[PDB]
Design a protein around this ligand. Structure first.
Ligand code: MG
Ligand code: MG
Ligand code: MG
Ligand code: MG
Ligand code: MG
Ligand code: MG
Ligand code: MG
Ligand code: MG
Ligand code: MG
Ligand code: MG
Ligand code: MG
Ligand code: MG
Ligand code: MG
Ligand code: MG
Ligand code: MG
Ligand code: MG
Ligand code: MG
Ligand code: MG
Ligand code: MG
Ligand code: MG
Ligand code: MG
Ligand code: MG
Ligand code: MG
Ligand code: MG
Ligand code: MG
Lengths: 318, 186, 186, 269, 165, 288, 48
RNA sequence: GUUACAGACUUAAGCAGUGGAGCAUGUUAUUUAAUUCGAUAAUCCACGACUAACCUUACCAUAUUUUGAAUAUUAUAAUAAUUAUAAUUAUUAUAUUACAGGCGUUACAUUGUUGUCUUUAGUUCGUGCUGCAAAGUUUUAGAUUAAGUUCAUAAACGAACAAAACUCCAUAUAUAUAAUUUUAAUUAUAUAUAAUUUUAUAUUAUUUAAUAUAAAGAAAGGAAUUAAGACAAAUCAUAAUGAUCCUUAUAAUAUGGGUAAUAGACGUGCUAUAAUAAAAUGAUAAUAAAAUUAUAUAAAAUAUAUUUAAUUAUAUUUAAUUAA
């Protein structure tokens, strides 16, 4: 009875079995729903800060496109920035995409731009930002190797770069490429496997606790509780979102040279329901109380010769 | 498995320790506001840990009631005023209270907290100074000199074994040391 | 094992209720074989398909907290001769409506124990009728501790049920909860 | 040293990777104010055996950056199929959170014990000598205009006064003196800085004390204590003054200690 | 995959992060010094200017930075180095912050009012008015000289014309 | 658990030893250590934090929140490659997956899965030809819903031929793909005299279309309706005369003509077997 | 807001090395050029 | 203007209203120098507009601005910061064109968003199969659910978007925390668990499903989410953009006026037409919740209206707190 009581007191684990919690690798922090991660007691000041942040975003967007002697215009796509306002310091951060060992000996335009953000001793952009906020700023770029890992980047890139493929109409090859980005992953199978792995982990911890046990609720040493639990085994299995299960991309507006009317054209793949939440302890949560956590929706509206159009993107991520 | 995990690691893995309160001489209370929980709770836990280790009997995250700033808005850009949408914002509030500490230790704690602060969390501190009734700022120069000596004692490099150093702090110390600074008052 | 549990090893989405019922029938009959005559093989095949008390205080009174609408009623019920004190004053002085008093009495009236138990009620929040109802609710819970055999009877009477009836919020377009503003087909 | 990139003359004897790193640093630090160097070029030529590049080609690249590279030498690979070697946005955010957590755990483990060096036992000022409590407020990251607010607060009986003088002091205080709790407090927000405000409050207190101790042709023996503000405050708040009747208690009806024999057997200490 | 280089925490590293308002006398001096450094435009919250970059040594802290009424655009004035940098460190500011010294204005005496106006009752009224003004102006925050000017104007010792300048 | 200094030094580095000692001094031996259920400070796996991980901790030289470095110093001056690649095994492949004219190859592959047909043959020897390419519509409550209809003869040019039709609401390429798929599913060995023409003069009715297809002397080409010609090219018929009466509905011609080929024809050998007689071809005997 | 905020003009001042492109401005210029071409350019402003 | 079920605030009961009165507000019409512009069947009419004195405003009268709010190009000159009396840069000034600017016109060029059908149960995908085919099957013999949701039967098998569920509020329980003076522990807030409730006896219809009874439970709601398509539904007056038109004027500033005009008409409301209903009074101050207070919330108290005083309204003057 004492042993049972001790177990009950210590019974905690990663959520997702059928005494458990959602770990920081199993769900998003609701702070990562907003883009200006701040609280100030004077709300005027907070408003001023969020205005500043918004203005800096525009500036960053402007910077992102370079030129090379009027030969090549490499348009680096960037995500919407997320500004982390700690008491000590601001930290701006964004995800970005850029399209033999010969380039160890010259600085690329993108590289130069990235260096400008933090490395130029006095001249750097972070230093200049610090005057607007009255605290040390740190811009961290994060490179994405694919166009479709971030939703904003995906939508933005298609808006800016791939004009010719959809201006008159969506070219067949381009559409095919869009369709067959991902390899049609059995999302049901993956979610179920993840759940099984979580169950196994829980059993392992429980087994260890039992082994230790053979009015105070202290078990044995840490090494014996977490016997088989390590950095190599657990973290990557527990990591929640990893697999772009399903995605929808919508082109809309005057994307027809002959026609006067508009054209809604939608590409759909995979699924947008998550089966990890359907049969387990882990529950779905809503970002800004209206977007299922796993979803991420975005649009970007480039102007054409004919007028305005936009490109919705929506990915699922198991 | 012949791998000695020392006590600090164990403490990290378990809940944070709290020192008992000898006397109810509330020295400082620290309120933590944020627009969500997960970061805030973590930060509070971290504050408790630092308070305990080289610490001042901190009580713990007493949740003060959350606010609710509501705002309603017509969904459309034009007319359809029968359809309206709500919006809300919850200011989550937690209280820490330090109970018995010599001011310097409390300052250090607070300074440490603000150094390794988290993203979403704002902070406010109410410090309390139990002073005597009658006071005097007449015997001045000597008191200034004493204060400077105390500062010097506080910020002395004991052993330069690649310790944490600050350029601005060094500059401040140099300014405090200077003859010009001493002259200021008289 | 459950239907869903069986599906994961069995058919999955293609598993039907009738199939599951058949499987259960097959297992149950096998299990029913007199334990002495059973085999090892059978048991191996079947292996797959397996898988606080309330008391009185130091001073002999049962505390209980009841709620209704916005009201909350913490009530100390004790074995002394049946007198009432609502919120630090006489019952007729607090609850002017006789209906509220009758409601309060009802837990003691379903039992033959009005007059047996002294009751010290302490209410907060809501209005008078809701407060009285919360007190009643608390009293029933308090009584339940004195004799657990009457608990079922109290539940049947409808006193042990927490009355959930919660005030509906004003929705945007509507004037009150349900009351919409006038329609006009013209 | 740290300041190494700035001097291209020194680094010829270093390994090739290190030389490359220094070159990259140099390019970074002075971005627009970059100006080529002979020693640096020589180093870069020496490194060339590391990463497969000819001697003329490296020199050409050094002279002309991206244009040179182009001259030395593409298909769009934006929607190339997923090779499963990079986490998505949400995933990456979750990882970052986990990194942060780990960092904080590390801090808790190895820096907070170090912090316990700087540890002092409490040196209490006695309530007899130190009755007044100047509370200061500070908003950390922000610059609130309430940071200037300082609040003095004292129990009036703890002040060194005779009984007549105490009454006079209380009368002078008016709304500031509460009578239920024998406490007099006052806050000042008039001045720019907090210290100023505290000083002003102190000066006021001193003036109040001086007035209390006067007694020359001004006693205030026959002005009763005005307690209207306090009763108004009490009305605004709620009260839970009532208690369980002491004669209603039944210690005899309370649950007696039930005899647990196995527990008794166990307790051999 | 490398060893954690533990840099030891120190009071010196936690200097700057000390609360701007803390009761202690020692802390007050430090806070004042920090404020003076900030006023001087010392590299706090930012990387310093040394003798490495020559052309691009820019700053934004000019006499009227985040302000509209002075007609200009963003002015990129060159920063000094860490050497050749002055610190303002004014006495009045020190008096305000470190000690708790305050001006309180001066109460206008009746004799001064008699100098201008003749009748006694009128003088007394003017004195009363000046007294009323004084306490209000003490309560308000504006500026040492400007506030005094306003007080004088309200009294009638100076005319209305001295404000509009 | 309070360990000795020497033991700690053996397993832990020299920097953290002092911190460990301090922790031991501060925290007593008799300690309870509660389990915080409502918030988790530490990770779900055991880790002595002495070793900084490449992926799971922050990259040292990279700037971020919680940098703990100077504004000048950030050791990260190339942004071409990714900073923190994935740990241990480079991939994050699920269980049972693999890493990676074209349309025709995809069709062939799909056929091989569904019906065990040789993909290489489908890719190379079979050659397709669209016969009809309608846009077609249905009046739904939603509205008029258009649909692209294809009808596509495929055929190895050695008497192996198949017709196929396909349909897609999405653009015609998909419909054509479906038609091609259908055609390869329905491959059919037509009989033909001398590997160039039909045996007899056939006269066949398929629904509306009345077909008439005469045999032809060698060299005399395909002299028939364009649909018939297309089908013959794919099916390896070099020589053919003929004429369509009544309906000339392209689809029904295409369906009717392959039916006529498979059904109306009798090979000489089959006829000989049925009757019990020799059935010589005089020209062949002569040697032209 | 804060009127002294970084603009595209400055992104040339701070970083001359990087040949930046303001996209909206470029678009506007292209539109203006198109207007000039097809006889829909702005009329020349009166001075007097 | 059809067959037969099913549907609900559809109807029927029922309770309170509108419609009559006066006022408020929106609309119309007409007026006006201007009564700015749009919304105008359900799906406009206290709607856009969560406050029209000036402003806001877009309208009108009279005045006066003309590279103007931007970006770039080309020149003269002046001031300030930095360096070791010169120079580099940053700015400002005067001009110089391209232009800037436009609540001007077209949501029948667009974006995004929204209304109605709609929390309605539909909408598709491969693929397979039937029909020469458009198409059909899937998506239904048979029933049922709130339901394309679930049983069965079926040339179908799955699927995606919908439905449901996860979500939020509220509830019950547990744990943690709060030195029970920031206390309301009768609380607040993080983390769990809990139900789309379960079990059994009977009575009708065919192993199940509805009724009833019983015993076990705190166990009973609301919110968000409103698919595809359609209505060339609404918006160029949130904002942006295409085309087009204005460029000493259709752009910009000030002073006043207007948006508040009034024959009839139309919605929404408010106050009424008195005794199952109105008014005075009720200080050991009968009983709430939710939310706001550094572009503030303003307590006590004095004075006048007012011979006592209370009430109510102002003035006098700011105690306390930027807040469990
Ligand atoms: Mg009705
Ligand atoms: Mg009427
Ligand atoms: Mg009426
Ligand atoms: Mg219009
Ligand atoms: Mg109108
Ligand atoms: Mg106009
Ligand atoms: Mg224009
Ligand atoms: Mg506009
Ligand atoms: Mg339209
Ligand atoms: Mg639209
Ligand atoms: Mg067919
Ligand atoms: Mg159907
Ligand atoms: Mg159908
Ligand atoms: Mg739903
Ligand atoms: Mg209490
Ligand atoms: Mg719809
Ligand atoms: Mg229309
Ligand atoms: Mg219209
Ligand atoms: Mg427009
Ligand atoms: Mg005009
Ligand atoms: Mg005007
Ligand atoms: Mg109006
Ligand atoms: Mg209305
Ligand atoms: Mg009446
Ligand atoms: Mg009052």
């Amino acid at each position: 009875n004492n042993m049972k009581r001790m177990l009950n007191n210590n019974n905690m684990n990663p959520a997702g079995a059928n005494g458990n919690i959602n770990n920081k690798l199993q769900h998003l922090n609701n702070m990562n729903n907003w883009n200006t991660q701040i609280y100030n007691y004077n709300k005027n000041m907070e408003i001023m800060n969020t205005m500043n942040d918004k203005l800096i975003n525009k500036l960053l967007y402007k910077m992102m496109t370079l030129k090379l002697n009027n030969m090549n215009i490499n348009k680096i796509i960037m995500s919407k920035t997320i500004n982390q306002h700690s008491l000590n310091k601001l930290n701006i951060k964004f995800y970005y995409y850029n399209n033999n060992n010969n380039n160890n000996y010259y600085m690329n335009m993108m590289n130069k731009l990235m260096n400008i953000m933090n490395n130029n001793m006095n001249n750097n952009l972070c230093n200049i930002l610090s005057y607007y906020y009255k605290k040390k700023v740190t811009i961290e770029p994060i490179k994405l190797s694919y166009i479709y890992l971030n939703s904003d980047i995906f939508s933005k890139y298609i808006s800016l770069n791939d004009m010719d493929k959809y201006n008159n109409g969506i070219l067949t090859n381009y559409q095919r490429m869009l369709n067959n980005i991902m390899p049609k992953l059995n999302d049901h199978n993956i979610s179920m496997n993840y759940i099984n792995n979580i169950n196994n982990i829980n059993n392992n911890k429980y087994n260890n606790m039992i082994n230790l046990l053979n009015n105070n609720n202290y078990i044995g040493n840490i090494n014996n509780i977490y016997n088989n639990m390590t950095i190599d085994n657990i973290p990557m299995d527990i990591l929640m979102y990893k697999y772009l299960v399903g995605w929808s991309i919508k082109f809309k507006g005057r994307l027809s040279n002959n026609n006067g009317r508009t054209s809604t054209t939608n590409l759909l793949n995979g699924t947008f329901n998550n089966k990890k939440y359907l049969w387990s302890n882990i529950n779905n949560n809503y970002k800004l109380n209206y977007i299922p956590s796993n979803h991420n929706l975005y649009n970007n509206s480039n102007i054409n010769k004919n007028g305005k159009y936009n490109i919705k993107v929506k990915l699922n991520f198991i | 498995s012949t791998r000695p995990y020392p006590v600090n690691v164990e403490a990290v893995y378990y809940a944070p320790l709290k020192l008992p309160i000898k006397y109810g001489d509330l020295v400082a209370d620290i309120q933590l506001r944020s627009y969500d929980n997960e970061n805030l709770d973590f930060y509070s836990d971290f504050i408790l840990r630092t308070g305990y280790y080289l610490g001042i009997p901190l009580t713990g995250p007493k949740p003060l009631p959350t606010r609710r700033e509501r705002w309603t808005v017509i969904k459309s850009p034009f007319v359809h005023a029968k359809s309206k949408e709500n919006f809300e914002r919850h200011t989550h509030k937690r209280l820490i209270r330090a109970w018995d500490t010599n001011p310097e230790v409390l300052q250090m704690l607070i300074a440490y907290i603000t150094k390794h602060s988290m993203a979403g969390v704002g902070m406010k501190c109410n410090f309390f100074q139990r002073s005597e009734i009658s006071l005097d700022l007449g015997s001045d120069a000597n008191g200034l000199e004493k204060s400077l000596s105390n500062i010097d004692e506080l910020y002395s490099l004991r052993n330069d074994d690649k310790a944490q150093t600050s350029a601005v702090g060094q500059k401040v110390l140099e300014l405090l040391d200077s003859p010009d600074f001493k002259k200021h008052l008289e | 094992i459950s239907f869903d549990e069986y599906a994961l090893i069995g058919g999955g989405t293609k598993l039907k209720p009738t199939q599951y019922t058949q499987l259960l029938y097959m297992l149950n009959k096998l299990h029913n074989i007199d334990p002495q005559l059973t085999n090892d093989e059978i048991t191996s095949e079947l292996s797959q398909y397996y898988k606080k008390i309330k008391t009185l205080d130091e001073f002999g009174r049962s505390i209980a907290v009841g709620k209704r609408k916005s009201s909350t009623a913490k009530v100390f019920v004790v074995r002394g001769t049946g007198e009432i004190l609502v919120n630090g004053r006489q019952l007729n002085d607090y609850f002017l409506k006789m209906k509220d008093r009758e409601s309060i009495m009802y837990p003691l009236q379903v039992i033959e124990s009005v007059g047996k138990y002294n009751i010290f009620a302490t209410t907060s929040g809501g209005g008078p009728t809701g407060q009285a109802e919360s007190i009643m609710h608390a009293i029933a819970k308090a009584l339940v501790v004195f004799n657990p055999l009457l608990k079922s009877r109290l539940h049947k009477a409808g006193v042990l049920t927490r009355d959930y009836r919660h005030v509906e919020r004003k929705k945007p377009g509507k004037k009150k909860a349900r009351k919409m503003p006038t329609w006009v087909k013209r | 040293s740290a300041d190494l990139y700035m001097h291209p003359e020194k680094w010829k004897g270093l390994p090739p990777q290190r030389i490359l790193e220094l070159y990259w640093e140099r390019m970074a630090r002075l971005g627009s104010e970059y100006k080529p160097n002979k020693d640096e070029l020589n180093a870069l030529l020496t490194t060339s055996e590391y990463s497969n590049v000819p001697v003329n080609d490296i020199k050409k690249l050094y002279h002309r950056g991206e244009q040179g590279a182009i001259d030395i030498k593409n298909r769009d690979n934006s929607l190339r199929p997923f090779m499963f070697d990079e986490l998505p946005s949400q995933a990456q955010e979750l990882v970052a959170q986990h990194r942060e957590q780990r960092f904080y755990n590390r801090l808790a483990a190895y820096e907070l014990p170090l912090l316990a060096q700087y540890r002092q036992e409490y040196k209490r000022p006695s309530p007899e000598s130190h009755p007044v409590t100047y509370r200061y407020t500070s908003y950390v990251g922000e610059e609130h205009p309430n940071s200037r607010k300082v609040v003095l607060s004292v129990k009036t009986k703890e002040l060194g006064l005779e009984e007549k003088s105490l009454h006079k002091f209380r009368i002078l205080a008016r709304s500031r003196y509460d009578h239920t709790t024998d406490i007099f407090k006052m806050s000042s927000d008039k001045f720019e800085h907090a210290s100023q405000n505290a000083r002003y409050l102190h000066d006021i207190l001193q003036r109040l004390l001086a007035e209390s101790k006067d007694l020359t042709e001004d006693d205030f023996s026959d002005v009763p204590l005005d307690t209207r503000h306090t009763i108004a405050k009490s009305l605004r708040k709620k009260k839970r003054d009532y208690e369980f009747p002491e004669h209603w208690k039944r210690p005899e009806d309370a649950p007696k200690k039930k005899f647990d024999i196995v527990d008794q057997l166990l307790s051999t200490l | 995959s490398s060893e954690y280089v533990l840099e030891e925490p120190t009071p010196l590293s936690l200097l700057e992060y000390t609360p701007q308002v803390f009761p202690t006398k020692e802390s007050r001096l430090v806070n004042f010094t920090l404020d003076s450094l900030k006023k001087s435009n010392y590299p706090i919250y930012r990387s310093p200017n040394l003798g490495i970059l020559k052309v691009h040594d820019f700053t934004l802290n000019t006499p009227n930075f985040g302000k509209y009424t002075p007609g200009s655009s963003l002015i990129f004035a060159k920063e000094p180095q860490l050497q050749n940098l002055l610190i303002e460190e004014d006495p009045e500011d020190f008096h305000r912050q470190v000690t708790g010294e305050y001006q309180l204005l001066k109460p206008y005496v009746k004799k001064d009012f008699e100098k201008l106006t003749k009748s006694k009752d009128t003088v007394s009224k003017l004195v009363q008015n000046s007294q009323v003004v004084r306490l209000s102006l003490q309560s308000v925050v504006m500026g040492s000289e400007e506030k005094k000017l306003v007080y004088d104007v309200c009294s009638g010792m100076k005319p209305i014309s001295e404000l509009q300048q | 658990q309070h360990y000795d200094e020497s033991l700690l030094s053996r397993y832990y580095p020299e920097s953290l030893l002092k911190s460990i000692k301090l922790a031991q001094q501060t925290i007593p031996e008799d300690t309870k250590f509660r389990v915080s259920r409502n918030v988790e400070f530490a990770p779900p796996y055991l880790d002595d934090f002495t070793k900084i991980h490449p992926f799971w901790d922050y990259k040292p030289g990279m700037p971020h929140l919680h940098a703990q470095e100077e504004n000048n110093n950030f050791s990260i001056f190339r942004w071409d490659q990714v900073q923190q690649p994935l740990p241990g095994e480079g991939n994050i492949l699920p269980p049972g997956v693999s890493l990676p004219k074209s349309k025709s190859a995809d069709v062939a592959a799909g056929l091989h899965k569904q019906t065990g047909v040789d993909p290489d043959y489908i890719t190379r020897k079979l050659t397709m030809k669209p016969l009809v390419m309608k846009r077609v519509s249905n009046q739904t409550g939603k509205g008029k819903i258009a649909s692209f209809y294809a009808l596509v003869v495929v055929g190895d040019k050695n008497g192996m031929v198949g017709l196929g039709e396909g349909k897609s609401r999405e653009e015609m390429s998909k419909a054509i793909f479906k038609a091609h798929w259908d055609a390869v599913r329905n491959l059919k060995e037509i009989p033909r005299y001398e590997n160039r023409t039909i045996y007899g003069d056939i006269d066949f009715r398929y629904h509306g279309v009345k077909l008439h297809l005469r045999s032809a002397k060698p060299g005399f080409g395909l002299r028939v309706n364009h649909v018939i010609f297309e089908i013959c090219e794919c099916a390896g018929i070099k020589d053919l005369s003929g004429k369509v009466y009544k309906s000339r509905n392209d689809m029904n011609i295409a369906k009717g003509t392959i039916e006529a080929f498979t059904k109306a024809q009798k090979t000489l050998d089959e006829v000989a077997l049925g009757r019990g007689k020799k059935l010589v071809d005089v020209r062949k005997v002569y040697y032209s | 807001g804060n009127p002294d905020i970084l603009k595209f003009r400055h992104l040339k001042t701070l970083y001359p090395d990087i040949e930046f492109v303001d996209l909206e401005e470029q678009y506007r210029l292209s539109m203006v050029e198109a207007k000039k071409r097809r006889g829909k350019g702005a009329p020349k402003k009166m001075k007097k």
